[PDB]
Coordinates of C-alpha atoms in Angstrom, one line a residue:
Chain A
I1 CA -145.6 41.1 -20.0
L2 CA -145.6 37.9 -22.0
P3 CA -148.9 36.3 -23.0
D4 CA -150.5 34.0 -20.4
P5 CA -151.5 30.7 -22.0
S6 CA -154.0 30.0 -19.2
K7 CA -156.0 33.2 -20.0
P8 CA -158.4 32.6 -22.9
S9 CA -157.7 36.0 -24.5
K10 CA -154.0 35.3 -24.8
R11 CA -153.0 38.5 -23.0
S12 CA -150.4 39.4 -20.5
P13 CA -151.3 40.2 -16.9
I14 CA -150.4 43.9 -17.6
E15 CA -152.6 43.9 -20.7
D16 CA -155.5 42.3 -18.7
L17 CA -155.1 45.0 -16.0
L18 CA -155.2 47.7 -18.6
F19 CA -158.2 46.2 -20.3
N20 CA -160.0 45.9 -16.9
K21 CA -159.0 49.5 -15.9
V22 CA -160.8 51.1 -18.9
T23 CA -164.6 51.3 -18.9
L24 CA -165.6 51.2 -22.6
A25 CA -169.2 52.4 -22.8
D26 CA -169.4 51.5 -26.5
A27 CA -166.8 48.9 -27.5
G28 CA -168.3 48.7 -31.0
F29 CA -167.7 45.0 -31.7
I30 CA -170.8 44.0 -29.7
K31 CA -173.6 44.2 -32.3
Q32 CA -175.9 45.7 -29.8
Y33 CA -179.0 45.0 -31.8
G34 CA -180.6 42.0 -30.1
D35 CA -180.3 43.2 -26.5
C36 CA -181.7 46.8 -26.9
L37 CA -185.2 45.4 -27.3
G38 CA -184.7 43.2 -24.2
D39 CA -184.6 45.9 -21.6
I40 CA -186.2 45.6 -18.1
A41 CA -185.6 49.1 -16.7
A42 CA -184.7 51.6 -19.5
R43 CA -182.7 51.6 -22.8
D44 CA -179.1 52.5 -22.3
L45 CA -177.4 55.6 -23.8
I46 CA -175.7 53.3 -26.3
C47 CA -179.0 51.8 -27.3
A48 CA -180.5 55.3 -27.7
Chain B
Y1 CA -214.3 69.6 -35.9
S2 CA -216.2 69.0 -39.1
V3 CA -219.2 70.6 -37.3
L4 CA -217.2 73.9 -37.0
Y5 CA -217.8 75.1 -40.5
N6 CA -221.6 75.1 -40.6
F7 CA -222.0 76.8 -37.2
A8 CA -220.8 80.3 -38.2
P9 CA -220.1 82.6 -41.2
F10 CA -216.4 82.5 -40.6
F11 CA -214.5 85.8 -40.9
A12 CA -211.1 85.0 -39.4
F13 CA -210.0 81.4 -38.7
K14 CA -206.3 81.9 -37.9
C15 CA -204.8 79.0 -36.0
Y16 CA -201.4 79.0 -34.3
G17 CA -200.5 75.7 -32.7
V18 CA -202.3 73.4 -35.2
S19 CA -203.6 73.8 -38.7
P20 CA -207.4 73.4 -38.8
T21 CA -207.1 71.1 -41.8
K22 CA -205.5 68.3 -39.8
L23 CA -207.3 69.0 -36.5
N24 CA -209.6 65.9 -36.1
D25 CA -206.6 63.5 -36.2
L26 CA -204.9 65.0 -33.1
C27 CA -205.7 64.2 -29.5
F28 CA -205.9 67.1 -26.9
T29 CA -205.5 66.7 -23.2
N30 CA -208.1 69.4 -22.4
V31 CA -210.2 71.7 -24.6
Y32 CA -211.1 75.2 -23.5
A33 CA -213.4 77.5 -25.4
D34 CA -213.7 81.2 -24.4
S35 CA -216.6 83.2 -25.8
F36 CA -216.8 87.0 -25.9
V37 CA -218.2 89.8 -28.2
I38 CA -215.7 92.2 -29.7
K39 CA -215.6 95.1 -32.1
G40 CA -214.6 95.1 -35.8
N41 CA -211.2 96.8 -36.0
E42 CA -210.0 95.1 -32.8
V43 CA -209.9 91.5 -34.2
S44 CA -206.2 91.9 -34.5
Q45 CA -206.1 92.8 -30.8
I46 CA -207.3 89.4 -29.8
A47 CA -204.0 87.6 -30.6
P48 CA -200.9 86.3 -28.7
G49 CA -198.8 89.1 -27.3
Chain C
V1 CA -211.2 81.0 -29.2
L2 CA -210.2 77.3 -28.9
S3 CA -207.3 76.5 -26.7
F4 CA -205.6 73.1 -26.5
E5 CA -202.6 71.7 -24.6
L6 CA -200.6 69.4 -26.8
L7 CA -198.6 67.9 -23.9
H8 CA -197.7 64.4 -22.6
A9 CA -200.9 63.7 -20.7
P10 CA -203.7 61.1 -21.0
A11 CA -205.8 62.6 -23.8
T12 CA -209.5 63.2 -22.9
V13 CA -210.7 64.2 -26.4
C14 CA -209.4 62.2 -29.3
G15 CA -211.5 63.2 -32.4
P16 CA -212.9 60.5 -34.7
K17 CA -212.7 57.2 -32.8
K18 CA -210.6 54.8 -34.9
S19 CA -209.1 51.8 -33.2
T20 CA -207.0 49.1 -34.8
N21 CA -206.3 45.9 -32.8
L22 CA -202.8 46.2 -31.2
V23 CA -200.1 43.8 -32.4
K24 CA -196.9 43.0 -30.7
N25 CA -193.4 41.8 -31.8
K26 CA -193.9 43.3 -35.2
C27 CA -192.7 46.4 -37.1
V28 CA -195.7 48.7 -37.1
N29 CA -196.7 52.4 -37.0
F30 CA -198.4 53.5 -33.8
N31 CA -200.7 56.4 -33.2
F32 CA -201.4 56.1 -29.5
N33 CA -203.3 59.4 -28.6
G34 CA -201.6 61.2 -31.5
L35 CA -198.1 59.8 -30.7
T36 CA -197.2 59.3 -34.4
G37 CA -194.2 57.1 -34.9
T38 CA -192.8 53.8 -36.0
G39 CA -191.3 50.9 -34.1
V40 CA -191.7 47.4 -32.7
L41 CA -194.1 47.3 -29.8
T42 CA -193.4 44.8 -27.0
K43 CA -195.0 44.5 -23.6
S44 CA -192.9 46.0 -20.9
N45 CA -192.2 45.3 -17.2
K46 CA -192.0 48.9 -16.1
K47 CA -193.7 50.4 -13.0
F48 CA -195.9 53.0 -14.8
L49 CA -197.9 55.0 -12.3
Chain D
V1 CA -160.3 60.2 -25.0
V2 CA -163.1 57.7 -24.4
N3 CA -165.1 60.1 -22.2
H4 CA -164.6 62.9 -24.8
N5 CA -166.0 60.7 -27.6
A6 CA -168.9 59.5 -25.4
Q7 CA -169.8 63.0 -24.3
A8 CA -169.7 64.3 -27.8
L9 CA -172.0 61.6 -28.9
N10 CA -174.3 62.2 -25.9
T11 CA -174.5 65.9 -26.7
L12 CA -175.2 65.0 -30.3
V13 CA -178.1 62.8 -29.2
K14 CA -179.4 65.5 -26.8
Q15 CA -179.5 68.0 -29.6
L16 CA -182.5 66.1 -30.9
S17 CA -184.7 67.2 -28.0
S18 CA -184.2 70.9 -28.6
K19 CA -187.1 72.8 -30.3
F20 CA -184.6 75.1 -32.1
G21 CA -187.2 77.8 -32.0
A22 CA -189.9 75.6 -33.6
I23 CA -193.2 74.5 -32.0
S24 CA -191.9 71.1 -31.0
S25 CA -188.7 69.0 -31.2
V26 CA -190.3 65.9 -32.6
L27 CA -190.8 65.8 -36.4
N28 CA -193.8 63.4 -36.5
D29 CA -196.0 65.4 -34.2
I30 CA -195.5 68.7 -36.1
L31 CA -195.9 67.0 -39.5
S32 CA -199.2 65.4 -38.4
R33 CA -200.4 68.7 -36.7
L34 CA -199.4 71.3 -39.3
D35 CA -200.5 71.7 -42.9
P36 CA -197.4 71.3 -45.2
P37 CA -197.2 75.0 -46.3
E38 CA -196.9 76.1 -42.6
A39 CA -194.9 73.0 -41.6
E40 CA -192.2 73.9 -44.1
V41 CA -191.0 76.7 -41.7
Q42 CA -190.9 74.4 -38.6
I43 CA -189.2 71.5 -40.5
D44 CA -186.7 74.0 -41.9
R45 CA -185.9 75.3 -38.5
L46 CA -185.4 71.7 -37.2
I47 CA -183.2 71.0 -40.3
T48 CA -180.9 74.0 -39.8

């Protein structure tokens, strides 16, 4: 439960597990403009 | 459709899907024209539904 | 009567033929076969049939 | 919670493709195909 210095995000193993166990479709702090134009198959729901 | 106006003495020019004013700008997939001769009082009968 | 189908199909009739040279990677207004709109047009790598 | 927010947003986007009783669900086509006096009704239906 204490932060792991080796991990670059400074998060505990439990925190890392919780982060990896949640599929955030739109995290918000991504600034998606810049990759929406560069699509090879179809624009994502977030881009739409 | 600028040649429409001089080809007939129009009596009824009601349009449903598109206004005749902005009719040249559009692009239509296919254009079908049906021609028939009808009476006077039944011009309302030739209409949707 | 004059019947048209304003549907997503390759337009056969297009009215007054006006064509402006297509530009890419720029903010422009497009009128491809009556598809009025605005956006940035970039070439795509899709598999259009 | 995340799925509820995502599905609410998705339904909000999908509401843009509904004709709402008008001729078409896209504003540009109806504006370019209808004279403004008639297009008032369709634009108002889309508005509401």
